[PDB]
């Protein structure tokens, strides 16, 4: 039995982190076992359809590097991979289940069901269509066969419901959650086929998991209360159920409850892998991608929300995750999201990149800001800035003094770094460096020689010099800054500082 898993999102909007993590654990489990990773688009509910969802899903999976072996876009041996295109399949299996005792016809109109729901509510009760109520309602169990024929002949709309067994203990086994039991008298007669012949999610999914030879169903815990019904649908069809693994919801950074988009808005962190623009507002929610997260760092971060790399390394690549991943070690306890941790991962991955690997994106940033520098200087600037960077764009945004002279000087910094003797000192410094081979270490030695001839610590020259070149006391070491911007730009900035601050 070749392992086969499917990511089965409905097209109802952008992928949340929980959905990315489910797709990832699908992919890892499949690849770890030499099996197949299927994408099935679960679009049976036409009214909940969100335009652009399916494109977003393909694009996010491609960005992260987990392309489905089978999908609507790519094809595969169980095409069509959109459920809206599988109606003939569901039609034939509907006929099959109606030959059993597990399904029946229900003619109740939505107004009739609204009425009985309101009667229960008024009493403090919740109406369920189940073993206790089905005999007072309008269906093929409660109505004589000749009346059912009459209704059918008149084209009376109906749904198909599952007939829950009476008082039956269903013993279930989940890879994550372990063993537990459900009595069917807690469950209702769920709708399996809507009144247009389209299956509901529950029926379409056991039909398609059976037809697509799925061996392991990995999904979120919101589906756990449905597992008993799904096992009983396999039983009704004469089929063996796959194995199940239910993932606990990602928790808020702080306080009780699940992570939501409202948290990311409220605290300033992205919630979707890629940009997405809401139709109903025109608003665009920026993705991790567009904010500068590397996909390798993003997916490493998502992987850790419930899985501990068996080798104890925090930093792990896609291919090492494939080799290491054990679905049996995925934790049942919920994992808290951490925006700081996501930034930490990006910073860690950025340090592991060579200056050359950063250089293409750095040049794109430089171009967007209308600046140019030689490849050789850009690589040195990347080297000098990358340790303190989280995103490639930080190398420019926090390093603007490499490309732009200061137009003013921070008042606090000026009081600290610039004294009534500083002007004369900086002009002497200009005279010293004007004849140098303008290399960092040579510059540093020349500054040291001026300091010791004047009886000063290094800081007495370096601090006003940094202020002169940067406009505040930020940046990397002054001699390397000077080498990058060059002799002419260095002197020109010392001159402007003298003219401004003496
Ligand atoms: N369409 C369902 C699929 C659940 C499953 O994997 O069975 C969802 O979006 O959650």
Task: Please report where in the chains the tokens 């910094």 appear, as a residue.
Answer: 413
Element (H, E) at 170: strand 169-174
The answer to whether the CB of 28 falls within 8 A of the CB of 218 is no
> Which atom of ligand 1 is nearest to 42's Cα?
1
Instruction: For residues 407 and 472, state if they share a domain.
Output: yes
- Residues 148 and 267 grouped into a single domain: no
Q: How many angstroms is it from 35 CA to the middle of ligand 1? A: 20
Question: What are the beta bridge partners of residue 106?
Answer: 139, 159
Q: Look at ligand 1, atom 3, and give the residue with the nearest C-alpha.
A: 8
Contacts of 154 (CB under 8 A, 6+ apart): none
Same domain, 376 and 454: no
Given resolution (angstroms): 2.0
Distance of CA 337 to CAs 250, 251, 258, 290, Å?
A: 7, 6, 10, 20
Q: How far is the CA of 9 from the centre of ligand 1 (A)?
A: 5
Q: Please, which residues bridge with residue 75 across strands?
A: 71
Distance CA 402, CA 482 (A): 9
Q: Residue 199 Cα, ligand 1 centroid: separation in angstroms?
A: 14
From the CA of 209, give the closest atom in ligand 1: 7
SS3 71: strand
Q: Which of 275, 337, 475, 311 is nearest to 394 (CA)?
A: 475
Residues 211, 63, single domain; the answer is yes
Give yes or no: residues 13 and 110 share one domain. no
Pocket probe for ligand 1: among 39, 199, 201, the residue whose CB has the most ligand atoms within 8 Å is: 201
Query: What gap in Å lies between CA 247 and CA 330, rounded to an integer?
Result: 8
Q: Examine the fold and report which residue of 173, 200, 227 is the final residue of a domain before the chain moves on.
A: 200
Q: Which residues pair with 191 in a beta bridge?
A: 161
CATH number, residue 4:
3.40.50.620
Query: What tokens were used for 147?
Result: 């009346």
In degrees and rounded to multiples of 5, residue 228 shows phi and psi of -55, -45
Q: How many domains does the chain have?
A: 5
Q: What is the token pair recorded at 326?
A: 């054990």
**Distance between CA atoms of residues 251 and 260, nearest Å:** 9
Instruction: Determine the distance separating the centroid of ligand 1 and the alpha carbon of 224, expressed in angstroms.
Output: 11
The CATH number for 134's domain is 3.90.800.10
Integer Cα distance of 220 and 18 in angstroms: 8
For residues 394 and 459, state if they share a domain. no
Q: Is 160 helix (H, G, I), strand (E, B) or coil?
A: strand
In a shared domain, residues 213 and 283: no
Cα angle for residues 303, 304, 307 (degrees, 5° grid):
90
Task: Say how far apart CA 307 and CA 320 lie, in whole Å.
Answer: 13
Based on the domain organization, do 37 and 54 belong to the same domain? yes
DSSP single-letter state for residue 248: P
Is beta strand 243-247 parallel, antiparallel or unpaired with respect to 178-183?
A: unpaired
Give me 475's structure tokens.
């940046």
Which ligand 1 atom is nearest residue 8's CA? 3
Tokens of 52: 């652009």
Q: Are residues 95 and 181 in the same domain?
A: yes
Domain identity same for 112 and 132:
yes
User: Do residues 259 and 249 lie in contact, with contact meaning Cβ atoms separated by under 8 Å?
Assistant: yes
Question: 165 and 149, same structural domain?
Answer: yes
HSE (side-chain half, CA atoms, 13 Å) at 442: 10
Compute the C-alpha angle 285/301/380, nearest 5°: 90
What is residue 70's DSSP assignment?
B
**What distance in Å separates the CA atoms of residue 179 and residue 500, rounded to the nearest whole number?**
76
Domain that residue 382 falls in: 354-400
Residue 369 dihedral angles phi and psi, to the nearest 5°: -95, 15
DSSP 459: H
The C-alpha atoms of residue 82 and residue 73 are separated, in whole angstroms, by 10
User: Is the CB of residue 45 less than 8 Å from the CB of residue 13?
Assistant: no
CATH code of 270's domain: 1.10.1160.10
Which domain-ending residue is among 400, 417, 435? 400
Together in a domain, 8 and 20: yes
User: HSE on the CB side for 261, CA within 13 Å?
Assistant: 11
Cα separations in angstroms, 365 against 103, 371, 483: 61, 9, 22
Q: Which three-class secondary structure state does DSSP give residue 64?
A: helix
Which residue's alpha carbon is at the smallest distance from atom 10 of ligand 1?
Answer: 9
Give me Rg for the CA atoms of the chain.
Answer: 33
Distances, alpha carbon 190 to alpha carbons 19, 168, 252, in Å: 25, 16, 32
**Structural tokens at position 363:** 């040049």
Ligand 1 pocket, mutate which of 42, 221, 231 (most atoms under 8 A from CB): 42
| Residues that are catalytic | 261
Question: What's the 287 CA to ligand 1 centre distance in angstroms?
Answer: 23
CA distances from 28 to 5, 25, 92, 354 (A): 10, 5, 34, 27
> Whose C-alpha lies nearest to ligand 1, atom 9?
9
Distance from Cα 195 to the centre of ligand 1, integer Å: 22
Cis bond before residue 112 (omega within 30° of 0): no
Closest CA to 198 of 91, 115, 348, 53: 91
Q: What is the residue-wise DSSP string for 375-425?
A: HHHHHHHHHHHGGG-SSHHHHHHT-GGGTS--SS--HHHHHHH--TTHHHH
Q: Can you say how many angstroms the Cα of residue 214 is from the centroid of all Cα atoms in its chain? A: 24
Q: Ligand 1 pocket test: which of 5, 56, 223 has the largest number of ligand atoms within 8 Å of its C-beta? A: 223
Q: CB within 6 Å of ligand 1 — which residues?
A: 8-10, 42, 201, 205, 217, 219, 223
DSSP codes joined into one string, 283-322: -EE--TTTTT--HHHHHHHHHTTT---TT--S---HHHHH
């Amino acid at each position: 039995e070749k392992v086969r898993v499917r990511f089965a999102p409905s097209p109802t909007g952008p992928l949340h982190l929980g959905g990315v993590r489910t797709a990832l654990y699908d992919y890892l489990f499949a690849k770890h076992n030499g099996g197949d990773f299927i994408l099935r688009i679960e679009d049976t509910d036409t009214q909940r359809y969100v335009p652009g969802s399916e494109e977003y899903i393909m694009e996010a999976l491609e960005w992260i590097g987990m392309v489905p072996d089978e999908s609507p876009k790519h094809g595969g041996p169980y095409a069509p991979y959109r459920q809206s295109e599988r109606r003939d399949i569901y039609d034939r299996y509907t006929e099959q289940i109606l030959k059993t005792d597990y399904a029946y016809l229900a003619f109740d109109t939505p107004e009739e069901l609204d009425q009985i729901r309101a009667e229960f509510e008024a009493r403090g009760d919740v109406f369920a269509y189940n073993y206790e109520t089905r005999n007072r309602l309008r269906n093929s169990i409660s109505l004589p066969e000749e009346e059912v024929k009459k209704l059918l002949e008149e084209k009376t709309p109906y749904v198909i419901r599952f007939k829950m067994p009476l008082d039956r203990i269903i013993n279930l086994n989940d890879i994550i959650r372990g063993k537990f039991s459900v009595n069917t008298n807690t469950l209702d007669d769920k709708v399996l086929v809507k009144n247009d012949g389209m299956p509901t999610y529950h029926f379409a999914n056991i039909i398609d998991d059976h037809e697509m030879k799925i061996t392991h169903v990995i999904r979120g815990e919101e589906w756990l209360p449905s597992m008993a019904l799904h096992v009983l649908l396999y039983e009704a069809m004469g089929w063996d159920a796959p194995e199940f693994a239910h993932l606990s919801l990602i928790l808020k950074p702080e306080g009780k409850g699940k992570l939501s988009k409202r948290d990311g808005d409220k605290f300033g962190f992205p919630v979707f892998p890629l940009n997405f623009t809401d139709s109903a507002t025109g608003n665009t929610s920026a993705g991790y991608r567009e904010e500068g997260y590397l996909p390798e760092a993003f997916i490493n971060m998502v992987a850790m929300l419930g899985w501990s790399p068996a080798d104890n390394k925090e930093i792990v690549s896609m291919d090492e995750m494939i080799k290491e991943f054990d679905l049996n070690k995925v934790h049942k306890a919920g994992a808290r999201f951490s925006a700081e941790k996501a930034k930490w991962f990006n910073q860690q991955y950025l340090q592991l990149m060579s200056n050359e690997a950063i250089l293409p994106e750095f040049k794109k940033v430089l171009a967007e800001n209308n600046v140019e520098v030689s490849d050789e200087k850009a690589l040195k600037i990347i080297g000098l800035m990358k340790e303190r960077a989280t995103f490639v764009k930080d190398i420019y945004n926090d390093g603007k003094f490499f490309f732009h002279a200061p137009e003013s000087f921070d008042e606090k910094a000026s009081k600290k770094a610039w004294s009534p003797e500083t002007a004369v000192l900086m002009q002497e410094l200009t005279e010293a460096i004007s004849s140098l081979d303008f290399k960092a270490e040579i510059i540093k030695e020349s500054i040291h020689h001026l300091a010791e001839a004047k009886g000063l610590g290094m800081g007495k020259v370096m601090m006003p010099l940094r202020l002169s070149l940067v406009g505040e006391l930020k940046g990397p070491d002054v001699p390397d800054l000077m080498e990058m911007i060059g002799k002419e730009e260095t002197i020109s900035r010392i001159n402007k500082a003298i003219e401004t601050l003496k």
